[PDB]
Amino acid sequence: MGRVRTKTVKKAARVIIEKYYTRLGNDFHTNKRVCEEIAIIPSKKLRNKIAGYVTHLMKRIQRGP
Amino acid sequence: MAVQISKKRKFVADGIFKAELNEFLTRELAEDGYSGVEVRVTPTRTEIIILATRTQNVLGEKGRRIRELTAVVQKRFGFPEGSVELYAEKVATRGLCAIAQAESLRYKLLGGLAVRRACYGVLRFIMESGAKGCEVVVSGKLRGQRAKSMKFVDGLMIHSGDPVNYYVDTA
Amino acid sequence: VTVKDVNQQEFVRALAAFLKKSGKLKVPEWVDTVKLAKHKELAPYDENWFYTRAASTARHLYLRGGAGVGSMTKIYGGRQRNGVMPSHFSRGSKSVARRVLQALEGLKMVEKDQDGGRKLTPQGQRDLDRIAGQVAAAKKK
Amino acid sequence: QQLYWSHPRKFGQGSRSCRVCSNRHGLIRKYGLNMCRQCFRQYAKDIGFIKLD
Amino acid sequence: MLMPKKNRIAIYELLFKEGVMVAKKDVHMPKHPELADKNVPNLHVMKAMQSLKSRGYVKEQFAWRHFYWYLTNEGIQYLRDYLHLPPEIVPATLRRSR
Amino acid sequence: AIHRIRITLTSRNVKSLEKVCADLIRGAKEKNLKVKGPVRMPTKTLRITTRKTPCGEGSKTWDRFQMRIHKRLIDLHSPSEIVKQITSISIEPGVEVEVTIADA
Amino acid sequence: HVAQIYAIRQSISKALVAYYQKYVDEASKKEIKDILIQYDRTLLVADPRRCESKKFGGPGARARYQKSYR
RNA sequence: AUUGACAGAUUGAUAGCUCUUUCUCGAUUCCGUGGGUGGUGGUGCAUGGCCGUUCUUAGUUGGUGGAGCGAUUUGUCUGGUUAAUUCCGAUAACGAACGAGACUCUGGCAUGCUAACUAGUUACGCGACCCCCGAGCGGUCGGCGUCCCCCAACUUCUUAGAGGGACAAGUGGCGUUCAGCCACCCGAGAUUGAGCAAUAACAGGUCUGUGAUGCCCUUAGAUGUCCGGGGCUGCACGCGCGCUACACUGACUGGCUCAGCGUGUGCCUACCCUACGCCGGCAGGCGCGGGUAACCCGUUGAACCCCAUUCGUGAUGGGGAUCGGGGAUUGCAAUUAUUCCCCAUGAACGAGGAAUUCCCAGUAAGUGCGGGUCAUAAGCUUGCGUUGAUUAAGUCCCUGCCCUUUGUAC
């Protein structure tokens, strides 16, 4: 009852995964810290949110394209 | 003499001083092209830095107007002699300073140039100077006697959020 | 066994009775006539109240030190009906707090301290802590 | 001549004005601001105040 | 050329001594900030300065109930004529820059 | 000497103040003597709340103008010349510095 | 007064758990902790509940001053 | 030329305002005219700026492309999804801009790190003082007050920095096995509460905030300005936000016992906060002290609450209006009662017709205390905490709003 991700998350997540598919994995906090290094994400909350969707697409990808 | 006023009351009075001066400098160096005052207190000295476009105009002939303004400041706020000085530095990228460009728009309007064409040129100047976007509002009576309003706008803006504080220059 | 070890309500019951039995306090002239603070509708229903609040004041001085009369008016403050307007805090009566602390001065329950204000004296600490020991050994209840 | 201003002007808003508009109503007197509440909002930013909450 | 002589002529010399001059817009100041030789209050000062300005011999800026009178070149010469002063004089804007 | 010199930094800005405080510790560690780490005094919040309107008549809405202010005070066991070298550096922002001599 | 009671009540039971954690063994602590929690989660885990600020236009946080309308 | 004057009559005035008289700056004056100036004068339907509202909802826009003679449309949408034009996905559109969200401040988690005499101290040491202070024959304890610095030991409590921290990430369902929703684990469960805030409007308010202002007006017998006085407080009456109550789940009298935001003098024009002692029943008075402040006020020793009091459903000790007498303080001045204290007086009111407001978590409500104004000073306000529910967890019946289709003589 609320938390959908905005387009400004979804895009960043998508573009991250295109490039750094290999680094990123299933666990959240792992790729949460990957998101920091490869992307100049300003807010910590935004980072945390991008990562969270980044897991979620990783899960989706690991089960067809 | 041995006052040492409250930390509370000191900071407020410092700001007040800065505010009054900003206004006096706005009002006096209007046509000259005033862009700000950046004060800094030091040991037995008070450097205040005036920001403007036409720096030769604010300093004056040979070293005149700056000496008058320091003397008037000195006289006014209760400053001992040689405790204060006016340092007229030049504004880098005038087309990003809004208050410079609002005065420039005031000037052109006073110059009798069309409400549209002056403002359109003001807009093109600031945008060529390399800004994310801009928003110009000449309002009030633009022909006739019912208060109409123009709104010449181009490019990227923000209104809402904290960002606007530091990311837009208003005037 | 100290005073903190005892139920403070029944302590001042005994202390006041200790202060009666001794019979050397100096309850002033007024007592009957006096109000007790501008708060009040009425005079205290206990007609031997000076013994009780002298007791309550001492036991306060045992706990919190350096307490002036101004401190004593603050401790016995309360609500004040303006009646039809909203209530506010009124501080306790000055003179009756003063007259108490002078009475404990003469008793030598107390001594006026360095850095101002009253504090209680050993010979007072005798009485206060003695009567606690009496109360504690009243019964297991 | 001697009686020209000659009325106790030491206390109350007959004395105290703003240090900008000089209108003697609705003054922020706290922290020695001494300015019209309209004038206070006018300048506030420069004075160092800011709306955060 | 007006009013009490000692007062006016003390204002004009203060305006000469310092190239600029200020007051506060306050009709009631039996002293004046600075000056203060003898009463020589706000007004006299305030009304002399307005007299200069009208005939062209001083300029103005107001800003927060105060006044700030910058003195002209044609004002300088009027003051010197009024005070029968020598041609060297040096008003205020001499000041070594560098 | 050697005496108990007390620096008193107070400012409206946080980040800028903490930079100055940190710089004064570096200068003290360079010319080794002492420090007693920088004391974050409790920040005061100068508040002024007014009606948004000039006039009486809109909806009754209110601005809440804050202004904060911090004090980092640092102690030091040193002579005067070293103090004047350190405190002359770390200026340009709005950090108001007050250097007390000893004790009070 | 009510607040202070719950505070100590919380404190003493938290303190106990911290003594057993450090200077007994984690198995006894574990049983102690369970005994208190099943009673009430207050004992260890505090409320985050705290007093909500009043905003103008009414006497409280939420309450609004009475609208006149007519 | 004709600025400025003790009388004494007059005057409210000790206004040299006027009449009789003094004598005076001595180059001020008076009169035109131009012309200013001033204005809490008029105009917010001449404007600016500033607020408010439509409009707290999800809305708004152009470029190029396509559709229409055109006004326009499309983009900006069947559907699902979301707090959200939020996303997914569709697709004559493509690719953008604001708004929403992100953001800022705040709330709560950190025995993690940095930190301290203007925090604590924190527990040690108890080095103690200290008197029987108490238990106790005496030792050892229990309790604080403190006497403590520094060459005790630190950061649990404290202050505030810079970091971490929660993401609907995990498990299960449901969902096109997308976007998502539900539940439960871990633990704060996406939701702590503010601030900021689009396009286009409004002939909303504001000229009495402005040395922002156009025009108009007035301008010395002034709508300028200052002084004296009165008025804004006048009461057949009608409405609006408030406070106190109608009692015993209470009142009064004692006793016990806990807060959190603040504020404070040595000032922009004359004065703060106040500890301790005396004097006074009390309001207050007089002495001395501290305090530009985590230093002093100040472990802010708040109220409600809690615990013993009576009292006994009587307009009663509930209620505290109105009114007489007296006393304090602020003030240049308080009468038309400034406020405070005191003794007396003791009204309607025994829960409120038709009507209608406000609110879902530390919320309403009770309950006090700060800020503002403020010489004097809150029944208002704006903050603060303390006590702490009931009921919902939804729907469009009412009142409104947002989108689509539709009709329309607006």
Closest CA relative to residue E11, chosen from E73, E58, E74, E55: E58
Asked if residue E69 belongs to a known ligand binding site, the reply is no
DSSP strands (E only) in D8-53: 27-28, 35-36, 50-51
Q: Which chain G residue is nearest to residue F50, measuring alpha carbons?
A: G56
Three-point CA angle F88, F91, F94, nearest 5°: 140
Strand H lies under 7 A from the Cβ of residue D10: yes
The CA distance from F92 to the nearest CA of chain B, in Å, is 6
CA–CA dist E21, E38 (Å, integer)? 18
For tokens 């009540």, name the residue: G9
Residues of chain F positioned with their CB less than 8 A from the CB of D49:
46, 48, 65-67
Chain E residues with CB under 8 Å of a chain D CB are 28, 64-65
For tokens 């006044």, name the residue: E67
F65 at interface of G, judged by CB pairs closer than 8 A: no
List bases, strand H, within 7 Å of protein CB. 4-5, 15-17, 25-29, 40, 46-53, 81-84, 86-88, 97-111, 114-118, 130-136, 142-147, 158-162, 164-170, 178-182, 187-188, 190-201, 203-206, 209-211, 226-228, 239-245, 251-258, 261-271, 274-284, 292-295, 298-299, 301-305, 307-310, 317-321, 331-333, 340-343, 346, 356-369, 371-376, 378-388
Contacts by residues F17-23 (CB-CB < 8 Å, ≥ 24 positions apart): F17/F70, F17/F72, F17/F93, F17/F95, F18/F72, F19/F90, F19/F93, F20/F72, F20/F90, F20/F93, F20/F95, F20/F97, F21/F72, F21/F74, F23/F89, F23/F90
Tokens found for residue F98 = 């007050």
Report the SS3 class of residue C99: helix
Resolution (A): 3.5
Helix, strand, coil shares of chain C, percent, nearest 5, are 50, 10, 40
Method used for this model? Answer: cryo-EM
Beta-bridged to residue B153, according to DSSP, are B135
Q: Determine the distance between B163 (CA) and H273 (C1') in angstroms.
A: 42
Domains observed in chain D: 1-53 (4.10.830.10)
Residue ranges making up the domain that contains F50: 1-104
Strands F95-97 and B85-90: unpaired
Strand H lies under 7 A from the Cβ of residue C36: yes
D27 at interface of F, judged by CB pairs closer than 8 A: no
Of chain G, the end-to-end C-alpha distance in Å amounts to 45
User: Are B20 and E18 in contact (CB < 8 Å)?
Assistant: no
CA–CA dist B41, B20 (Å, integer)? 16
DSSP annotation of A43 reads: -
Q: For domain B7-90, which CATH number applies: 3.30.428.10, 3.40.50.300, 3.30.300.20, 3.30.420.130?
A: 3.30.300.20
Strand H lies under 7 A from the Cβ of residue C26: no
CB-CB neighbours of B117 under 10 Å: 10
User: Are B15 and D33 in contact (CB < 8 Å)?
Assistant: no
Closest CA relative to residue B76, chosen from E67, C52, G60: E67
Contacts by residues D28-37 (CB-CB < 8 Å, ≥ 24 positions apart): D28/F48, D28/F50, D30/F48, D31/B8, D31/B9, D31/B12, D31/F46, D31/F48, D32/B9, D32/B12, D32/B13, D33/B12, D33/B16, D33/F48, D37/F50, D37/F51
Count the residues in chain G.
70
> Do the beta carbons of residue B105 and residue B136 sit within 8 Å?
yes
The CA distance from E5 to the nearest CA of chain B, in Å, is 24
Q: Which chain F residue is nearest to residue G55, measuring alpha carbons?
A: F62
Strand H lies under 7 A from the Cβ of residue C106: no
CA–CA dist C100, B53 (Å, integer)? 78
CATH annotation of E1-98: 1.10.10.10
User: Are B8 and F69 in contact (CB < 8 Å)?
Assistant: yes
DSSP strands (E only) in E1-98: 20-22, 68-70
> Do the beta carbons of residue C34 and residue C44 sit within 8 Å?
no
E60: left (phi over 0), alpha (psi -120 to 50) or beta: beta
